[PDB]
Design a protein around this ligand. Structure first.
Ligand code: CDL
Ligand code: 3PE
Ligand code: 3PE
Ligand code: 3PE
Ligand code: 3PE
Ligand code: 3PE
Ligand code: ADP
Lengths: 459, 42, 344, 47, 54, 120, 97, 100, 319, 51
């Protein structure tokens, strides 16, 4: 997998060497094709995972993501052509390159055989992200948000560093292939009960768990649209990908060491879903929607039943695409409105007829409408959770009712009701804004036709 | 129409002073002379 | 300085560490340490500002008593073994003295009070020498005697330094002292692995030298001893803003940059030796060091602090360039990580 | 032009010739070392 | 529970714990006598650390 | 560590014994990296000194890309040796002190009985 | 000798306690500092003499020669201080705080 | 008070360039930055990509297994063998701990 | 550039110094016909006559030398100084701070010419004499107390390093007669200036500048009549004995370091940009970024001297 | 190759990429055809099973 990567690196030379006026089209047009080369990995006509080479591999779980990581770079670069079009021609070429490095790094992290290669690349992604959030962040508080995003991930990260070096000594190689075909069975000691927490905690932090998710609402609030898309679509899912490949070892402990997180997540799912119900900042509501719909995932990567896992793989890819779509349209309202407040800007369909159709489809993806991969995902996690304990439906049942309420409230108070009297007149929709959306949903429609590709390792 | 908030004078002020997190007494501390030379003489 | 004097002094400041390293007769190692003490004091008071005399008089007393303690260890050994050099048989107290003494000259842990203060009153230039070409000498003496020193003490001085360095740095706003504090911290990691794998001490030093030497020549390019002063870097010289950003995050352990390797292999070696208690606590507060590094990042790069009108005047005039060493030592430092296996 | 002329306007032609010439000595020694090396390796071992 | 209790406990507390710890460790007179004595204390403790673990 | 080994060359860079090892291919990814590492140093310099970034010092750019690379071949040549000594040393010991590193028989899974924790 | 070697060693520790417990004048310290060099010189000379190790007598003196200059530097700093403050009290050396 | 700029207004890019596509202010760059984005975006990724992904053959073997079952079910049923025997790894191969 | 290599191998300032080689400043009120005297004295001993420091003196100093736009040169107007005293934006303090930076550049350029060529220096008003304008400005409502402290801090940080004027000349004409001198020169901004403000300027010299410098250098007071007679004044300069003053201790090995300072303009005014945030001085990040990101794009300024092709530089690919 | 030297950057990466990914194979070619499930015997005039 060096075509999904080397051609990517070369994007950096192109963003720099290219003309200031033509820099945007060379980069966006080329990474669209970079995504097309990424599609070749999907050709698995057999079960055997595709070990491209010693360090680089792609199995069913990584492949559905590498393609998404390559896909969003085009979109990210199309959603940030407006803001970042007021810059000095060298601030742009830095932002474009920053976005380019994220997927170079993220493509490799999702396509990495050695778990510590994951760690080095895993924690590197913070550098590009922190720059995108802090340097171009509009609000006074991004310095703070950046600190929260760096420390919560970093304090979790050093325990994983110690744990992975620890298993290398215990087993003798951090190669995901071998670690899988070798006998690593923890022994339920008090210490192992700590190892397990060391490995999972760093992944559980960037996958916002109810206890440590305050970093994500603060980060996406002041982050520029491209950073918020990356955090929701690819960055948070780095934590999920890690939990799937790391729990191959630590096989016995999670049977009983998971209860704490599972309950934290399911109760967390309800409270995070509910506070979405009365949050005035739209970007705030989407972020907590992201916490709740990701709290379902940590509760399926821990129950560990075949269906959970691919419920997880289905939902992660699906929610990634949906969340961005929501964060992308939130930005389009923010740029004309100039405020994140949900109460202002009422009635837009009256003035932006189509964006409202995109808003409606994004919300229906947000809630579980049935001919969507989003529902298949939740339906499956719901099933397994029920298997874990029939009572789980109650808590995963209060979340579904709340999820319907906030998803439609975003449509009802942003895209319906009487028009706002006279905010700065809202200029019509650009074709870029609409495509950036179409590019998010057309793939959501196509993937829903053949869900098999994003089903995970389990199935 | 947007101005990512660049730091104003007040945000800058805190970083002055001989200690970032000033203590009740350490608050009295005064930034050392920029020239690295002091006024005392007698 | 009459250029002749400059030569004699500089030769001594350079013959000082070199005799230490080359000789085996400890005595000759002691006088190597003694010269370094004599040569550095003249340069320290070059401005001869009231702050400077204070600096040198502290540096000298701290250095002198430690030098006398190191000599006492050699004198005692001479009577416990006729040899003029530490051996397997050496009384444990004899070696511990040498650790404390040498940990004072290097300024590690509970003897970390002199360094921040002398780093504050000396010029940026002599600051570098006082931080990096004066640590080579004592460390050489320790690295030579590693097989014999105590694992317990070193670790305590190691951990303490890491903490003191980190905590001290958080509050400081003067750059010279932020660096002094960082050096205490890095010096700590170095002395942690000495008993186990000296060869890694020599890596955690070089990398510190290849990181600090560019960082200081950066601080002086604009001769800013204040963060507020380095924050207006964007107006005085915009290009160094990019690398100053990476070098400081490299000084802390963040993974893509070269700075991770020293911490990573030291942790790998300590876990190989089973100190998974000690290594863990060190790595954790090591994370405190990055917080103050990033706070500076914020002021200098990620956020643009307001500047005075006269800054436009300094822009007009051609900026005297930074030596080539900056580049070669900025890149070899910010990004060599892809080449770690051969470094270790 | 400039009221205060640059010190670098016309190239330091020494700095070119020791910069260019030095690099071409590096290669001719480097490439030499490799082929020479390869041989030593081959003869010192079986081939 | 969001905002105050989950921000005062984990994110903010760790902020304060350190802030306070730096304030005590870095509030130093700057006088040499004080500092030096501390060197005295250290020598004493290390002398003991060796002694008791002889 | 590896110092104190019999025959150690007290101050030599790469003992001739390292002749026996294969020479590093000049295009070894690493040496090529050092090259890029170098080009960047050059470009960076131009930038910090405020010169046209790429179109200036085309002589220097060469000195850099060619100094770093030169250094590489001769360094890697050594680091390669050091690692090679490590095996000579390591493998030898495994034998000279055989009992301590005994070959082990691993029972076919048929025989071994790892317990099965059910997920249910 | 074994008995005496103790006295000299404690002399060095009593001189150690002195230099690590300042009080007013610095010249006192530097003076104390020298008390150690004498104790080291005496101990080095004593053992060299009862080990009949003549090859080592060079050291007892090298110790003094280096110690003398060391002290020369120390006093020049001292003179520099009572030229900038004129009272040589370790008390006023606190600008660096 | 210190000197700083007065708030910059955001232009109605739709006032000039009434055909603004949202990519860049000058018109030709805009046209050529959508003529290449709709094309490389939709026309040869959503179309050629979906074509290729649709034609990936027997992805993860699930087109092979619906036949292998059919000949196994064909073979097992006609020869009278159990369709899915109840132990997979044959009991004979296993060497159960004898005592316990 | 000059370095210890050059110092070690010849290139000593001592052997380049001669009787006519001194730093001579002539200071007076807003209108002392000072200009003529200087150029006259200059003509006498061949002294390089430096003109009075200006807003764009630094731009004439650097690169092309064409005058810079006001905002590029710090947005200072002497013109606005006068028509709008005690202005809300404080153009008067910004004018004074830029003026101090300009003379700092001029004095340093003068010292560089003195130690290299050995030709003596006439620079009109000096940094030492600049304070009289600020003293008078604080005496009236022009500047507030802190503003004064900020200038004093910059003065204390940078002025001591440079050696003092060898001799200072004082072309004095009374408070009333300068205002009539002002009345006939044409600019209207110079006209209508406060008589009391002019009172405070010359009073500040007499009270502080001449006595202070009366030991640091040979002050030569001249009344208007002695003035307009460059010959006589020139004669007197050639008459005074350059003995009393700090210049006596400047051995060659001491001059070298001073030379290497003035040789580096970026340092000469290093402390002129100290991060003290008084409101008038502050660029402001958004405005400052635009002003820098605009000044740096001017032809020949994008890159270092010798490397920008716009103005016709060549050989960049080998430099 | 003029004014089009910035359009052939990324494409070239691809080729180089493919050049390496087919070179990695060349290295990892043990068990070329020595695997159990796929150990056919060489068909006449065929050098190796998979290249
Ligand atoms: C672009 C310029 C390209 C110039 C090409 C010149 C012609 C040429 O070299 O082609 C023939 C030549 C033939 O190679 P080959 O030996 O036949 O390839 C087969 C190898 O088996 C294939 O190589 P290999 O995998 O066997 O190489 C061994 C080793 C080789 O190791 C390396 O070279 C690492 C290079 C990293 C780049 O593998 C690794 O890379 C391990 C390290 C992986 C990354 C570890 C660090 C990850 C975190 C940090 C990432 C970087 C952060 C930088 C700092 C932050 C910057 C902001 O191609 C190369 O050698 C270059 C390949 C690309 C090198 C990296 C270029 C970037
Ligand atoms: C990211 C790697 C970019 C590599 C670009 C290679 C081509 C090139 O020469 O670009 C250098 C890049 C841009 O330079 P330029 O085109 O002059 O425009 C910006 C001027 N500051 O300016 C650069 O130096 C970019 C590389 C900075 C060093 C880190 C590389 C990783
Ligand atoms: C905050 C987010 C959550 C972080 C959790 C951190 C947990 C502590 C760090 C990693 C702990 C770990 O690695 O667990 C295993 C280790 C001992 O494991 P083991 O190899 O069995 O050693 C005994 C050999 N018979 O057990 C240990 O390492 C004990 C570590 C002691 C220090 C705890 C952390 C202090 C941090 C300050
Ligand atoms: C592993 C990934 C690690 C992280 C990589 C991405 C982050 C790189 C580090 C960025 C750190 C600084 C962030 C803030 C920078 C602010 C820059 C700025 O304010 O602009 C001015 C600056 C200098 O300006 P000048 O070039 O003189 O001309 C313009 C004058 N206004 O303008 C400049 O400085 C221009 C040159 C900037 C440097 C270019 C770097 C491009 C991005 C490098 C990505 C490398 C990705 C490597 C991936 C490896 C995968 C294995
Ligand atoms: C289980 C989940 C554990 C989550 C841990 C989260 C740690 C980071 C949370 C936020 C910490 C923070 O914001 O630090 C601020 C603190 C004071 O500095 P300042 O930012 O100026 O003040 C703001 C005060 N809120 O700055 C500080 O004083 C240091 C803050 C901590 C930095 C990391 C310390 C790790 C220590 C490990 C032992
Ligand atoms: C080690 C990691 C922990 C470091 C801190 C340990 C406690 C230090 C301490 O308590 O010193 C307090 C002192 C300030 O005292 P004060 O302002 O009164 O604080 C009281 C606030 N209510 O603060 C100070 O005086 C400076 C810090 C004092 C401690 C210096 C280092 C002590 C190291 C202890 C172990 C030494 C082992 C030596 C082995 C040889
Ligand atoms: N620090 C200062 N503040 C305000 N104005 C100043 C300052 N320094 C010089 N000037 C201006 O310089 C003018 C006097 O210069 P002038 O005598 O006309 O030059 P010339 O020497 O060519 O005759 C005064 O009007 C005064 O405003």
């Amino acid at each position: 997998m060096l075509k999904i990567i080397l051609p990517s690196l070369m994007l950096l030379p192109l963003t720099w060497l290219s003309s200031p006026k033509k820099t945007w089209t060379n980069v966006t047009s080329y990474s669209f094709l970079i995504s097309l080369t990424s599609l070749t990995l999907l050709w698995q006509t057999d079960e055997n995972y595709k070990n491209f080479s010693n360090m680089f591999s792609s199995d069913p779980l990584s492949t559905p993501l590498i393609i998404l990581t390559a896909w969003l770079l085009p979109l990210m670069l199309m959603a940030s052509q407006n803001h970042l079009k007021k810059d000095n021609n060298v601030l742009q070429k830095l932002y474009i390159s920053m976005l380019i490095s994220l997927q170079i790094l993220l493509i490799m992290t999702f396509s990495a055989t050695e778990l510590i290669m994951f760690y080095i690349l895993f924690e590197a992604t913070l550098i590009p992200t922190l720059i995108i959030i802090t340097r171009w962040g509009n609000q006074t508080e991004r310095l703070n948000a950046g600190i929260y995003f760096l420390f919560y991930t970093l304090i979790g990260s050093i325990p994983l560093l110690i744990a992975l070096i620890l298993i290398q000594n215990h087993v003798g190689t951090l190669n995901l292939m071998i670690l899988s075909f070798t006998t690593h069975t923890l022994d339920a000691s008090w210490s192992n009960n700590l190892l397990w927490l060391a490995c999972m905690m760093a992944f559980l932090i960037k996958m916002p768990l109810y206890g440590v998710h305050l970093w994500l609402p603060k980060a996406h609030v002041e982050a520029p649209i491209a950073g918020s898309m990356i955090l929701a679509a690819i960055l948070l899912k780095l934590g999920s990908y890690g939990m799937i490949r790391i729990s191959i070892i630590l096989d016995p402990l999670t049977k009983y060491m998971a209860y704490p997180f599972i309950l934290l997540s399911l109760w967390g799912m309800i409270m995070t879903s509910s506070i979405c119900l009365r949050q005035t900042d739209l970007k705030s509501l989407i972020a907590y929607s992201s916490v709740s719909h990701m709290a379902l995932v940590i509760a399926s990567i821990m129950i560990q039943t075949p269906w959970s896992f691919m419920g997880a793989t289905m939902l992660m890819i699906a929610h990634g695409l949906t969340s961005s779509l929501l964060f992308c349209l939130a930005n389009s309202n923010y740029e004309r409105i100039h405020s994140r407040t949900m109460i202002m800007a009422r009635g837009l369909q009256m003035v932006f007829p189509l964006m409202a159709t995109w808003w409606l489809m994004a919300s229906l993806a947000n809630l579980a409408l049935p001919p969507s991969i989003n529902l298949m995902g939740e339906l499956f996690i719901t099933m397994s959770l029920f298997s874990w304990s029939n009572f789980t439906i109650i808590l995963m049942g209060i979340n579904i009712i709340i999820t319907g309420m906030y998803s439609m409230y975003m449509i009802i108070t942003t895209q319906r009701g009487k028009l706002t009297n006279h905010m700065i007149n809202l200029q019509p929709s650009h074709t870029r804004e609409l495509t950036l959306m179409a590019l998010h949903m057309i793939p959501l429609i196509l993937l829903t036709t053949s869900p098999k590709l994003i089903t995970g390792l389990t199935m | 129409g947007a101005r990512q908030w660049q730091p104003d004078i007040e945000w800058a002020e805190q970083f002055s002073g001989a200690v970032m997190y000033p203590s009740k007494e350490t608050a009295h501390w005064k930034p050392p002379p920029w020239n690295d030379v002091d006024i005392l003489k007698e | 300085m009459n250029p002749i004097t400059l030569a004699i002094i500089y030769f001594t400041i350079f013959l000082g560490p070199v005799i230490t390293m080359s000789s085996t007769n400890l005595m000759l190692m002691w006088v190597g340490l003694e010269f370094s003490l004599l040569a550095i004091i003249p340069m320290l008071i070059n401005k001869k500002n009231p702050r400077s005399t204070e600096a040198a008089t502290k540096y000298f007393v701290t250095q002198a008593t430690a030098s006398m303690i190191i000599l006492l260890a050699i004198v005692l050994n001479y009577k416990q073994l006729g040899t003029w050099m530490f051996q397997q048989q050496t009384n444990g107290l004899i070696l511990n003295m040498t650790l404390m003494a040498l940990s004072m000259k290097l300024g590690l842990a509970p003897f970390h009070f002199w360094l921040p203060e002398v780093t504050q009153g000396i010029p940026l230039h002599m600051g570098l020498i006082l931080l990096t070409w004066q640590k080579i000498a004592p460390l050489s003496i320790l690295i030579q005697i590693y097989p014999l020193l105590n694992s317990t003490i070193i670790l305590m001085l190691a951990i303490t330094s890491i903490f003191m360095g980190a905590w001290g740095g958080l509050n400081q706003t003067q750059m010279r002292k932020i660096m002094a504090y960082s050096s205490i911290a890095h010096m700590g990691w170095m002395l942690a692995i000495l008993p186990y794998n000296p060869s890694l001490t020599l890596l955690n030093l070089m990398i510190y030298i290849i990181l600090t030497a560019p960082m200081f020549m950066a601080l002086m390019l604009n001769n800013s001893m204040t963060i507020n002063s380095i924050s207006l870097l964007w107006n005085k010289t915009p290009a160094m803003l990019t690398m100053i950003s990476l070098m400081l995050l490299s000084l802390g352990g963040l993974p893509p940059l070269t700075g991770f390797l020293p911490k990573w292999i030291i942790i790998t070696e300590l876990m190989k030796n089973n100190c998974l208690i000690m290594a863990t606590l060190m790595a954790m507060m090591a994370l405190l060091n990055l917080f103050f590094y990033t706070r500076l990042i914020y002021s200098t790069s990620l956020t643009m602090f307001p500047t005075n009108n006269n800054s436009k005047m300094m822009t007009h005039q051609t900026k005297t360039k930074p030596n080539l060493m900056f580049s070669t030592l900025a890149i070899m430092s910010t990004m060599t990580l892809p080449l770690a296996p051969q470094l270790i | 032009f400039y009221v205060r002329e640059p010190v670098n306007a016309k190239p330091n032609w020494l700095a070119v010739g020791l910069s260019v010439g030095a690099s071409v000595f590096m290669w001719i020694y480097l490439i030499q070392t490799h082929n020479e090396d390869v041989l030593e390796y081959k003869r010192r071992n079986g081939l | 529970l969001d905002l105050i209790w989950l921000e005062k406990t984990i994110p903010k507390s760790t902020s304060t714990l350190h802030t306070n710890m730096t304030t005590l460790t870095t509030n130093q007179k700057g006088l040499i006598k004080l500092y030096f004595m501390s060197f005295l204390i250290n020598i004493i403790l290390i002398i003991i650390l060796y002694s008791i673990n002889l | 560590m590896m110092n104190g080994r019999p025959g150690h060359e007290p101050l030599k860079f790469l003992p001739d014994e390292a002749r026996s090892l294969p020479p590093p291919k000049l295009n070894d990814p690493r040496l090529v990296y050092m090259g890029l590492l170098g080009y960047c140093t050059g470009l960076m310099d131009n930038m910090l000194r405020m010169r046209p970034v790429m179109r200036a010092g085309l002589h220097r750019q060469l000195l850099f890309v060619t100094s770093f690379v030169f250094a590489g071949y001769f360094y890697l040549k050594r680091q390669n040796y050091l690692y090679a000594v490590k095996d000579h040393d390591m493998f030898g010991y495994i034998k000279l002190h055989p009992e301590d590193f005994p070959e082990k028989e691993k029972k076919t899974y048929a025989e071994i009985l790892e317990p099965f924790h059910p997920v249910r | 000798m074994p008995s005496t070697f103790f006295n000299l060693t404690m002399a060095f520790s009593l001189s150690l306690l002195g230099t690590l417990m300042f009080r007013s004048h610095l010249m006192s310290t530097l003076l104390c500092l020298e008390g150690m060099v004498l104790s080291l010189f005496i101990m080095t000379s004593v053992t060299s003499l009862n080990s009949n190790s003549m090859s080592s007598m060079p050291i007892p003196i090298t110790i003094l020669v280096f110690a003398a200059c060391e002290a020369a530097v120390g006093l020049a700093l001292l003179v520099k201080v009572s030229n900038t403050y004129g009272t040589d009290y370790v008390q006023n050396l606190n600008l660096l705080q | 008070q210190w000197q700083e700029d007065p708030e910059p207004e955001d232009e109605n890019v739709y006032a000039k360039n009434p055909d603004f596509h949202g990519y860049d202010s000058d018109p030709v760059v805009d046209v050529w930055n959508m003529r290449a984005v709709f094309f490389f975006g939709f026309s040869i990724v959503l179309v050629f990509g979906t074509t290729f992904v649709a034609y990936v053959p027997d992805y993860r073997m699930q087109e092979w297994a619906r036949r292998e079952a059919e000949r196994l079910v064909k073979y097992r049923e006609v020869n009278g063998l159990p369709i899915m025997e109840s132990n997979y790894f044959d009991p004979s191969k296993i060497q159960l701990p004898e005592d316990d | 550039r000059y370095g210890l290599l050059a110092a070690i191998l010849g290139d000593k300032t001592t052997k380049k110094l001669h009787e006519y080689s001194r730093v001579i400043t002539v200071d007076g009120n807003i209108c002392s016909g000072k200009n003529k005297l200087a150029k006259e004295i200059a003509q006498q001993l061949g002294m390089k006559h430096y003109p009075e420091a200006g807003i764009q003196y630094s731009s004439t100093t650097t690169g092309d030398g064409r005058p810079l736009d006001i905002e590029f040169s710090g947005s200072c107007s002497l013109e606005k100084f006068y028509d709008d005293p005690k202005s809300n934006d404080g153009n008067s303090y910004r004018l004074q701070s830029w003026l101090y930076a300009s003379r700092l550049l001029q004095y340093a350029d003068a010292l560089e010419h003195l130690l290299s060529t050995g030709q003596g220096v006439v620079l009109e008003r000096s940094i030492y004499s600049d304070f009289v304008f600020l003293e008078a400005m604080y005496n009236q409502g022009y500047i507030r107390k802190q503003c004064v402290d900020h200038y004093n801090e910059i003065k204390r940080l940078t002025l001591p390093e440079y050696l003092p004027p060898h001799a200072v000349i004082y072309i004095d004409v009374p408070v009333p007669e300068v205002q009539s001198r002002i009345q006939k020169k044409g600019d209207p901004h110079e006209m209508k200036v406060t008589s009391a403000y002019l009172q405070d300027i010359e009073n500040a010299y007499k009270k502080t500048f001449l006595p202070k410098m009366s030991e640091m250098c040979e002050v030569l007071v001249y009344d208007s009549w002695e003035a307009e007679d460059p010959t006589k004044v020139v004669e007197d300069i050639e008459y005074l004995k350059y003995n009393k003053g700090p210049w006596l201790k400047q051995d060659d090995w001491t001059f070298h370091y001073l030379r290497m300072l003035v040789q580096d303009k970026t340092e000469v005014l290093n402390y002129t940009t100290i991060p003290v945030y008084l409101p008038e001085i502050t660029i402001g990040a958004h405005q400052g970024s635009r002003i820098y990101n605009s000044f740096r794009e001017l032809p020949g300024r994008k890159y270092a001297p010798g490397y920008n092709a716009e103005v016709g530089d060549k050989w960049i690919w080998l430099k | 190759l003029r004014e089009h030297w910035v359009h052939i950057l990324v494409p070239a990466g691809f080729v180089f990429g493919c050049y390496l990914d087919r070179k990695d194979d060349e290295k990892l070619t043990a068990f070329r055809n020595k695997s159990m499930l796929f150990q056919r015997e060489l068909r006449p005039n065929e050098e190796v099973t998979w290249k």
